[PDB]
Design an enzyme around this catalytic site. Structure first.
Site, PDB file in Angstrom:
ATOM      1  N   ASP A 422     -31.600  41.772 -22.960  1.00 35.40           N
ATOM      2  CA  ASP A 422     -31.251  40.490 -22.368  1.00 35.40           C
ATOM      3  C   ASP A 422     -30.075  40.684 -21.423  1.00 35.40           C
ATOM      4  O   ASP A 422     -29.195  41.514 -21.669  1.00 35.40           O
ATOM      5  CB  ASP A 422     -30.923  39.442 -23.436  1.00 35.40           C
ATOM      6  CG  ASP A 422     -29.533  39.596 -24.001  1.00 35.40           C
ATOM      7  OD1 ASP A 422     -29.097  40.747 -24.190  1.00 35.40           O
ATOM      8  OD2 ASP A 422     -28.875  38.565 -24.253  1.00 35.40           O
ATOM      9  N   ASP A 751     -27.747  39.822 -27.501  1.00 35.50           N
ATOM     10  CA  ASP A 751     -26.383  39.331 -27.661  1.00 35.50           C
ATOM     11  C   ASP A 751     -26.277  38.364 -28.839  1.00 35.50           C
ATOM     12  O   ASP A 751     -25.509  38.603 -29.775  1.00 35.50           O
ATOM     13  CB  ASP A 751     -25.918  38.662 -26.360  1.00 35.50           C
ATOM     14  CG  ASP A 751     -24.408  38.661 -26.203  1.00 35.50           C
ATOM     15  OD1 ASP A 751     -23.748  39.621 -26.654  1.00 35.50           O
ATOM     16  OD2 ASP A 751     -23.878  37.694 -25.618  1.00 35.50           O
ATOM     17  N   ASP A 755     -31.855  35.689 -29.230  1.00 38.43           N
ATOM     18  CA  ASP A 755     -32.570  36.926 -29.486  1.00 38.43           C
ATOM     19  C   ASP A 755     -32.872  37.135 -30.962  1.00 38.43           C
ATOM     20  O   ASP A 755     -33.533  38.118 -31.307  1.00 38.43           O
ATOM     21  CB  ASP A 755     -31.756  38.111 -28.959  1.00 38.43           C
ATOM     22  CG  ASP A 755     -31.609  38.093 -27.451  1.00 38.43           C
ATOM     23  OD1 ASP A 755     -32.526  37.594 -26.767  1.00 38.43           O
ATOM     24  OD2 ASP A 755     -30.571  38.569 -26.952  1.00 38.43           O
TER      25      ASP A 755
HETATM   26  N1  LIG Z   1     -22.840  26.729 -21.985  1.00 37.89           N
HETATM   27  C1  LIG Z   1     -23.861  26.268 -21.153  1.00 37.89           C
HETATM   28  N2  LIG Z   1     -23.904  24.960 -20.819  1.00 37.89           N
HETATM   29  C2  LIG Z   1     -24.927  24.581 -20.004  1.00 37.89           C
HETATM   30  N3  LIG Z   1     -25.914  25.340 -19.478  1.00 37.89           N
HETATM   31  C3  LIG Z   1     -25.808  26.640 -19.855  1.00 37.89           C
HETATM   32  C4  LIG Z   1     -24.793  27.195 -20.707  1.00 37.89           C
HETATM   33  N4  LIG Z   1     -24.961  28.560 -20.905  1.00 37.89           N
HETATM   34  C5  LIG Z   1     -26.052  28.877 -20.205  1.00 37.89           C
HETATM   35  N5  LIG Z   1     -26.588  27.745 -19.559  1.00 37.89           N
HETATM   36  C6  LIG Z   1     -27.770  27.636 -18.693  1.00 37.89           C
HETATM   37  O1  LIG Z   1     -28.872  27.866 -19.501  1.00 37.89           O
HETATM   38  C7  LIG Z   1     -29.642  28.913 -18.930  1.00 37.89           C
HETATM   39  C8  LIG Z   1     -30.340  29.701 -20.052  1.00 37.89           C
HETATM   40  O2  LIG Z   1     -29.669  29.571 -21.195  1.00 37.89           O
HETATM   41  P1  LIG Z   1     -29.543  31.114 -22.182  1.00 37.89           P
HETATM   42  O3  LIG Z   1     -30.995  31.444 -22.163  1.00 37.89           O
HETATM   43  O4  LIG Z   1     -28.949  30.391 -23.366  1.00 37.89           O
HETATM   44  O5  LIG Z   1     -28.599  31.732 -21.144  1.00 37.89           O
HETATM   45  P2  LIG Z   1     -28.757  33.353 -20.483  1.00 37.89           P
HETATM   46  O6  LIG Z   1     -27.255  33.510 -20.477  1.00 37.89           O
HETATM   47  O7  LIG Z   1     -29.494  33.086 -19.191  1.00 37.89           O
HETATM   48  N6  LIG Z   1     -29.516  34.010 -21.719  1.00 37.89           N
HETATM   49  P3  LIG Z   1     -29.739  35.715 -21.796  1.00 37.89           P
HETATM   50  O8  LIG Z   1     -29.756  36.172 -20.354  1.00 37.89           O
HETATM   51  O9  LIG Z   1     -31.050  36.027 -22.542  1.00 37.89           O
HETATM   52  O10 LIG Z   1     -28.538  36.071 -22.652  1.00 37.89           O
HETATM   53  C9  LIG Z   1     -28.689  29.824 -18.129  1.00 37.89           C
HETATM   54  O11 LIG Z   1     -29.334  30.362 -17.073  1.00 37.89           O
HETATM   55  C10 LIG Z   1     -27.716  28.734 -17.621  1.00 37.89           C
HETATM   56  O12 LIG Z   1     -28.249  28.215 -16.466  1.00 37.89           O
HETATM   57 MG   LIG Z   2     -27.187  37.001 -23.916  1.00 37.66          MG
END
Ligand SMILES: Nc1ncnc2c1ncn2[C@@H]1O[C@H](COP(=O)(O)OP(=O)(O)NP(=O)(O)O)[C@@H](O)[C@H]1O
Ligand SMILES: [Mg+2]
Ligand SMILES: CCCCCCCC(=O)OC[C@H](COP(=O)(O)O[C@@H]1[C@H](O)[C@H](OP(=O)(O)O)[C@H](O)[C@H](OP(=O)(O)O)[C@H]1O)OC(=O)CCCCCCC
Ligand SMILES: CC(C)CCC[C@@H](C)[C@H]1CC[C@H]2[C@@H]3CC=C4C[C@@H](OC(=O)CCC(=O)O)CC[C@]4(C)[C@H]3CC[C@]12C
Ligand SMILES: CC(C)CCC[C@@H](C)[C@H]1CC[C@H]2[C@@H]3CC=C4C[C@@H](OC(=O)CCC(=O)O)CC[C@]4(C)[C@H]3CC[C@]12C
Ligand SMILES: CC(C)CCC[C@@H](C)[C@H]1CC[C@H]2[C@@H]3CC=C4C[C@@H](OC(=O)CCC(=O)O)CC[C@]4(C)[C@H]3CC[C@]12C
Ligand SMILES: CC(C)CCC[C@@H](C)[C@H]1CC[C@H]2[C@@H]3CC=C4C[C@@H](OC(=O)CCC(=O)O)CC[C@]4(C)[C@H]3CC[C@]12C
Ligand SMILES: CCCCCCCCCCCCO[C@@H]1O[C@H](CO)[C@@H](O[C@H]2O[C@H](CO)[C@@H](O)[C@H](O)[C@H]2O)[C@H](O)[C@H]1O
Ligand SMILES: *[C@@H]1O[C@H](CO)[C@@H](O)[C@H](O)[C@H]1NC(C)=O
Ligand SMILES: CCCCCCCCCCCCO
Ligand SMILES: CCCCCCCCCCCCO
Ligand SMILES: CCCCCCCCCCCCO
Ligand SMILES: CCCCCCCCCCCCO
Ligand SMILES: CCCCCCCCCCCC
Ligand SMILES: CCCCCCCCCCCC
Ligand SMILES: CCCCCCCCCC
Ligand SMILES: CCCCCCCCCC
Ligand SMILES: CCCCCCCCCC
Ligand SMILES: CCCCCCCCCC
Ligand SMILES: CCCCCCCCCC
Ligand SMILES: CCCCCCCCCC
Ligand SMILES: CCCCCCCCCC
Ligand SMILES: CCCCCCCCCC
Ligand SMILES: CCCCCCCCCC
EC number: 7.6.2.-
Length: 1046
Positions: A422, A751, A755
């Site tokens: 990821d 992370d 996952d």
């Molecule tokens: N704290 C947050 N508040 C609001 N939107 C969020 C937040 N964190 C992440 N996002 C949005 O949610 C999307 C997907 O969420 P997640 O899948 O939880 O994030 P990622 O960091 O893209 N995951 P990964 O790459 O698998 O670790 C991200 O691309 C952001 O656009």
């Molecule tokens: Mg992650």
């Protein structure tokens, strides 16, 4: 999944089994059910059946306990408690009684649970403890020592004690005791490392309907009982739905990530309390509560929902205690291998019995000699060798900082061929840098603003300051890194007095500065937060509601993924060129998050993020970790496929994949975009070839569309796909499941919090930001980087080679000793008494335990370890080594016959009464040096293991054994008395024996080297298989003849 119930004759069955004396093998074989029924008092009546056998298609049996209040027939299976209902006649799980319970019922459980109902539900659900019993030592001895192998070793001890071979019996006893002790230590550590984790023992406050106060132990909790949470914080006694107030918790024990999480009170209404859709409103067992606020009353009230093993932590513990069977076979072919070895042993003992019958020996002595030979065939050190090899590998991993709950999965790492990662946290740095914010005017973007501090007072600044789940914990804000860096960028420092709706959850203060500029127009005013809607990866969104000392009406701010947020926003507020400009930032590798707002007309989450309007984008940098490009390059160099599965934007994921080497230059990448059906036709599955092998990249919704509308084309996409973006955690575990369906050995590194499902579904799951052992995934690393991935692979290979080197060597030992005694049987000698002890413990057991201490090669390679013992090279090596050893031993015997000095053994007296006789000594010396030679030769180095001289204990052992044996030959005699050797009284012939065994050393090494060098080429040239057992290789070939995307 069929349960069958069965109620003086059992003692008859036991007596029959004792008379047979081997009925356990029949009952431990294809017909165990018949024996069980014949020795169970069969009675199909489940209401009366005190025993029950469950088949899961595999076969388990359990008692039927009965607890009285009046009567309650329950039983435990896999840790889960099932009970018998008189109104149904069948068994129902305890967790399924209060299924479909409505949220209004949970709220109405705010009041206390009376002591009568408390004890009723205590009897029903049992105590609230994840029970991992401590095993008494005799229990472990009876469990482990009781099996066919150790029983046969005991029989061998008895047989060798019968014929006055006291020393050999004693040393076999010692070997068996050592093996039992090692197995016991392994099992005890395995139980203890799990038991220490689930140690929850503390008092908890619970309010009764009358009195409304009582402190009880954690075990005295039952479902439907309320719980006053400690506002100072602490561990969570059990699973409960939060009914009142808010909670800041740290649920890393079952989620991986250790960031604070916000749990809001359960929303009152009609509808089942799912506990998975309401996951943001539930507190889980064994999770630390950083704080708990009421805002509506004195105490933060939760309601206990599930206790004991049915809790999520309890479920993970149950899985660990009873792991699912490994999908990928490790050997699954040893039956034929040991069959061939037994065939050789039978062709040998036929010669033994015949030659013994040839000479004058009593029939009782004949059968005794035969059974002695069969006992010598079996080595007693095999379980000890297995256990010590596994323990060494686990200790090596722990020294490297990686912990595996059950080492049985370690060898899976030696045959991984696909690894998922990821993006955020694992591949890239956890932290973020706020590059800037892009605002809108009404329908047109504006230049990026580097520091958001300089924005004027308005919706965008307030949204940046307020939209998050930050909370102060010991004079420090804590929360998501994204939120922390955003609020730091704004400067609005986090700081009753309800404005309109309810009591304020938090307050923000603008940083005092710019007496002229700040107060130039509308000086900033503090902002209060009324409602909070936490973020969840499933829905890329976070909504907050706020007000201020102005604020004619409240205002709702939504922070989320740009695509989803823009979908939620008013169409005339989104500029036409939103997609291109977002590409202009995401194609540069920036994490972009959209902010939108709506002024509420003075609250379920649905009605908040509705008719929104774009406020802007937040562009923030996120760099690759410095030790991810080399790791990815190494993995791709070794033909190990690497895939990216992330919830981030597709453009950012593609850029990061290009940067880290998953998509190297001059490797074409296509984007697959399937449009949802519009009621006129299905998805079109558009292809967009990008511009700087074949790679495919696709987002989450298109992946789901391809899964559910192009099942035929799914395997090709999975085989070629490398970058999957915008996937929910459910989609990630689904993708892992599909990859496994294609017969891939799928490992994953993650992370946290998105996952966990994929990590558990994966053959090899690794968690990075974990302090120590956890039930989150099969493997867990302390350091936070991708470097843990190769080592877990390397060690796995080092294990797979190492294990083989045991099965080879101890097989060689098993049979090189078999032929030697046969030679003596042909001359009517029996290899001495203390000589056996010297062969086993002094020479063989120490070498077998020490050889597995060698570490991994410190570098990966394209050559995978074998997967079957009975491969052509292995069997060829065994046979050729036996030919060499037999030739050496026979040549030694024939040369000893051909000397000026010689006196044949007195054949008219059975051994050991004719020793040393000048033939036993030479055969014994040759056999000893042969054991050392075989041990040295079997233990390979490259490509999987280190060179033999790495593990200095094993090398020292080899040197000392060689030296003491050389002394045993090249001296007038010091141990020849106890060892019953004839003291060859010439300094010429013994030197010739030393030269001959040096030739044997050289022969073994040259033989094994020539085999390894030449046989693979011969097999490549001779049998051109075209492997097609695995579907993914078939798909790779089919794409190789012609690609599917033109
Ligand atoms: N704290 C947050 N508040 C609001 N939107 C969020 C937040 N964190 C992440 N996002 C949005 O949610 C999307 C997907 O969420 P997640 O899948 O939880 O994030 P990622 O960091 O893209 N995951 P990964 O790459 O698998 O670790 C991200 O691309 C952001 O656009
Ligand atoms: Mg992650
Ligand atoms: C009397 C003989 C009895 C022994 C019978 C059993 C023989 C036996 O297990 O070998 C099978 C292999 C076939 O090969 P096999 O070992 O089955 O090779 C398979 C492939 O290698 C497969 O995919 P690719 O990697 O794409 O190739 C994968 O690796 C599997 O895992 P594995 O490699 O980890 O095990 C293997 O099962 O080799 C023969 O093709 C000999 C056939 C017999 C020769 C007869 C000579 C008389
Ligand atoms: C040719 C003749 C004279 C030699 C036959 C040797 C027997 C005396 C050996 C053969 C198999 C041995 C048995 C192999 C396995 C067991 C299982 C063991 O019980 C278990 O551990 C089973 C537990 C389970 O799996 O449920 C007790 C010893 C026993 C009966 C062994 C006792 C000795 C046996 C009967
Ligand atoms: C059939 C007659 C004419 C031969 C006389 C010798 C037998 C008594 C030998 C031949 C095969 C031997 C067996 C060969 C292999 C094993 C495997 C060994 O491993 C296990 O089965 C236990 C493994 C586990 O519990 O994990 C236990 C002893 C046993 C049954 C041996 C017991 C003694 C046997 C039956
Ligand atoms: C000369 C005759 C009497 C031979 C006797 C053989 C011994 C030399 C063997 C028997 C058990 C062996 C030990 C068995 C287990 C281990 C555990 C192994 O460490 C672990 O894997 C566990 C680490 C931990 O959990 O602390 C290091 C080797 C060692 C000490 C072995 C070293 C060699 C020992 C003492
Ligand atoms: C009855 C008399 C003739 C016996 C004299 C002992 C020898 C047979 C020596 C030669 C090699 C020795 C072994 C060589 C090395 C070790 C390493 C060491 O064991 C470990 O592997 C410790 C692992 C660790 O803690 O790092 C100490 C005992 C042992 C097994 C030694 C035990 C005694 C052995 C077998
Ligand atoms: C006439 C000649 C007759 C002899 C013919 C030759 C027979 C050879 C039989 C070899 C048996 C191999 O046995 C194989 O290794 C050991 C034996 O304890 C077992 O090992 C098992 O128990 C040990 C603990 O005791 C565990 O640590 C190990 O995880 C487990 O698999 C294997 O499950 C068994 O499959
Ligand atoms: C060997 O022992 C036997 C005992 O019967 C007997 O023949 C003699 O004492 C010894 N020597 C020879 C050559 O037989
Ligand atoms: C002659 C006996 C030699 C020992 C052979 C050991 C082979 C066991 C392989 C299978 C291990 C897992 O069941
Ligand atoms: C394992 C090999 C078994 C065959 C051993 C035959 C020994 C013959 C030696 C006696 C003949 C020389 O005088
Ligand atoms: C290779 C060593 C074999 C074990 C030797 C056991 C004898 C130890 C010496 C005893 C001295 C008193 O007789
Ligand atoms: C572990 C073995 C050490 C003790 C062995 C004692 C051997 C006694 C043999 C006596 C006959 C030769 O003097
Ligand atoms: C398990 C059998 C142990 C036997 C103990 C032998 C002790 C040495 C004595 C040998 C001469 C009687
Ligand atoms: C760090 C290497 C450890 C080596 C263990 C000691 C080897 C010598 C033991 C000799 C005993 C006779
Ligand atoms: C799986 C349990 C194996 C029990 C040993 C079987 C030996 C059979 C000899 C005929
Ligand atoms: C790396 C191969 C090691 C060869 C040396 C074996 C030990 C020799 C002891 C004298
Ligand atoms: C680094 C070259 C090999 C070193 C050999 C050390 C062991 C020698 C005794 C056999
Ligand atoms: C782990 C590296 C070991 C280096 C070789 C040691 C040789 C020592 C001879 C006793
Ligand atoms: C690593 C330094 C120790 C190496 C061992 C040397 C031989 C010792 C004989 C007991
Ligand atoms: C160190 C081992 C060799 C010592 C042998 C010295 C005497 C040999 C003449 C029999
Ligand atoms: C390997 C030990 C050598 C001992 C000295 C050899 C003397 C032999 C004279 C022919
Ligand atoms: C001439 C008699 C033999 C001399 C010794 C041969 C070399 C021994 C190698 C171990
Ligand atoms: C690793 C190759 C070993 C070469 C043969 C060693 C012979 C040494 C005589 C003591």
């Amino acid at each position: 999944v069929r349960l069958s119930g069965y109620c003086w004759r059992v003692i008859g069955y036991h007596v029959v089994v004792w008379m047979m004396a081997g009925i356990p093998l029949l009952l431990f074989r294809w017909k165990p059910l018949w024996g069980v029924r014949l020795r169970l008092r069969p009675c199909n009546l489940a209401h009366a059946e005190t025993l029950v056998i469950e088949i899961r298609d595999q076969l388990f049996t359990v008692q039927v306990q009965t607890e009285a209040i009046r009567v309650l027939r329950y039983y435990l299976f896999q840790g889960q408690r099932y009970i018998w209902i008189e109104t149904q006649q069948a068994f129902y799980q305890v967790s399924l009684l209060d299924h479909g319970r409505s949220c209004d019922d949970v709220h109405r459980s705010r009041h206390g649970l009376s002591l009568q109902d408390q004890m009723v539900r205590k009897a029903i659900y049992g105590p609230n403890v994840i029970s991992i019993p401590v095993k008494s030592y005799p229990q472990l001895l009876v469990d482990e020592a009781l099996n066919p192998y150790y029983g046969f070793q005991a029989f061998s001890i008895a047989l060798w004690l019968a014929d006055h071979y006291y020393w050999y019996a004693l040393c076999i006893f010692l070997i068996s005791s050592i093996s039992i002790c090692l197995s016991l230590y392994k099992t005890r550590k395995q139980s203890q490392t799990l038991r220490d984790m689930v140690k929850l023992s503390m008092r908890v406050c619970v309010c009764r309907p009358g009195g409304e106060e009582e402190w009880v132990d954690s075990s005295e909790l039952v479902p439907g009982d309320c719980l006053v949470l400690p506002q100072e914080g602490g561990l969570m006694p059990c699973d409960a739905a939060l009914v009142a107030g808010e909670c800041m918790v740290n649920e890393s024990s079952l989620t991986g990530e250790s960031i604070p999480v916000l749990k809001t009170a359960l929303p009152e209404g009609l509808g089942p309390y799912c506990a998975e859709t309401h996951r943001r409103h539930t507190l889980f067992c064994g999770t630390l509560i950083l704080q708990a606020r009421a805002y509506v009353g004195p105490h933060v009230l939760a309601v206990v929902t599930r206790t004991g093993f049915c809790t999520a932590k309890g479920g993970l513990v149950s899985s660990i205690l009873h792991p699912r069977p490994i999908n990928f076979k490790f050997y699954k072919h040893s039956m034929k291998f040991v069959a061939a070895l037994s065939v050789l042993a039978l062709l040998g003992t036929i010669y033994s019995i015949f030659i013994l019958y040839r000479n004058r020996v009593p029939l009782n002595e004949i059968v005794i000699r035969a059974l002695d030979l069969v006992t010598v065939v079996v080595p007693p050190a095999l379980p000890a060798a297995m256990t010590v090899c596994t323990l060494y590998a686990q200790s090596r991993l722990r020294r490297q900082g990686i912990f595996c709950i059950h080492p049985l999965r370690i060898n899976l790492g030696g045959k991984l061929q696909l690894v998922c990662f990821d993006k955020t946290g694992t591949l890239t740095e956890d932290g973020l840098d706020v590059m800037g914010v892009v605002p809108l005017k009404g329908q047109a973007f504006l230049p990026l603003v580097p520091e958001p501090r300089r924005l004027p007072v308005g919706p965008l600044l307030r949204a940046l300051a307020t939209c998050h789940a930050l909370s102060r914990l010991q004079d420090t804000p804590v929360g998501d890194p994204m939120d922390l860096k955003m609020v730091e960028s704004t400067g609005w420092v986090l700081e009753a007095d309800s404005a309109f709706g309810t009591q304020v959850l938090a307050v923000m203060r603008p940083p005092l500065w710019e007496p002229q500029l700040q107060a130039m127009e509308e000086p900033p005013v503090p902002v209060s937060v009324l409602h909070r809607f936490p973020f969840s990866s499933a829905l890329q969104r976070m909504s907050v509601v706020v007000a201020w000392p102005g604020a004619t009406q409240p205002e709702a701010y939504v922070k989320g993924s740009p695509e989803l947020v823009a979908g939620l926003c008013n169409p005339e507020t989104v500029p036409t060129d939103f997609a291109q400009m977002l590409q202009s930032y995401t194609a540069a590798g920036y994490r972009v998050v959209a902010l939108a707002s709506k002024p509420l007309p003075t609250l379920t989450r649905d009605t908040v993020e509705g008719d929104l309007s774009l406020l802007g984008l937040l562009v923030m940098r996120n760099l690759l970790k410095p030790q991810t490009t080399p790791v990815i390059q190494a993995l791709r160099r070794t033909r190990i496929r690497a895939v990216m599965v992330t919830g981030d934007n597709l453009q950012t994921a593609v850029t990061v994949a290009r940067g880290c080497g998953m998509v190297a230059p001059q490797e074409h990448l296509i984007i697959v975009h399937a449009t949802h059906p519009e009621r006129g036709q299905p998805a079109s599955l558009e292809f967009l070839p990008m511009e700087s092998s074949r790679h495919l990249a696709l987002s989450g919704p298109t992946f789901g569309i391809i899964v559910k509308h192009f099942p035929k084309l799914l395997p090709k996409v999975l085989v070629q796909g490398t970058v999957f973006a915008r996937m929910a955690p459910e989609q990630k575990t689904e993708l892992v499941c599909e990859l496994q369906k294609l017969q891939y050995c799928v490992g994953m590194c993650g992370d946290g919090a998105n996952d966990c499902g994929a990590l558990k579904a994966a053959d090899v799951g690794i968690s990075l930001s974990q302090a120590e052992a956890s039930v989150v995934s099969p493997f867990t690393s302390s350091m936070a980087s991708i470097e843990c991935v190769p080592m877990v692979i390397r060690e796995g290979r080092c294990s797979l080679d190492t294990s083989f080197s045991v099965f080879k060597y101890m097989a060689l030992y098993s049979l090189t000793q078999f032929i030697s005694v046969l030679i003596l049987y042909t001359i009517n000698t029996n290899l001495g008494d203390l000589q056996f002890l010297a062969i086993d413990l002094v020479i063989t057991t120490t070498v077998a335990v020490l050889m597995s201490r060698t570490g991994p090669a410190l570098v990966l390679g394209r050559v995978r370890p074998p997967g079957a013992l009975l491969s052509v090279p292995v069997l060829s090596s065994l046979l050729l080594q036996m030919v060499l050893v037999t030739g050496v031993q026979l040549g030694g015997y024939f040369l000893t016959l051909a000397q000026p000095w010689f006196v044949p053994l007195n054949r008219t007296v059975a051994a050991p009464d004719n020793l040393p006789n000048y033939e036993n000594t030479v055969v014994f010396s040759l056999s000893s040096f042969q054991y050392l030679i075989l041990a040295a030769a079997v233990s390979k180095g490259a490509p999987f293991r280190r060179p033999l001289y790495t593990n200095v204990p094993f090398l020292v052992a080899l040197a000392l054994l060689s030296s003491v044996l050389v002394g045993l030959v090249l001296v007038p005699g010091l141990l020849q008395g106890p060892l019953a050797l004839r003291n060859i009284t010439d300094t010429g012939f013994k030197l010739l024996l030393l030269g001959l065994v040096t030739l044997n050393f050289v022969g073994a090494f040259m033989l094994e080297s020539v085999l390894d060098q030449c046989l693979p080429a011969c097999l490549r040239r001779l049998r051109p298989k075209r492997a097609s057992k695995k579907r993914f290789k078939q798909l790779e070939r089919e794409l190789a003849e012609q690609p599917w995307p033109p």
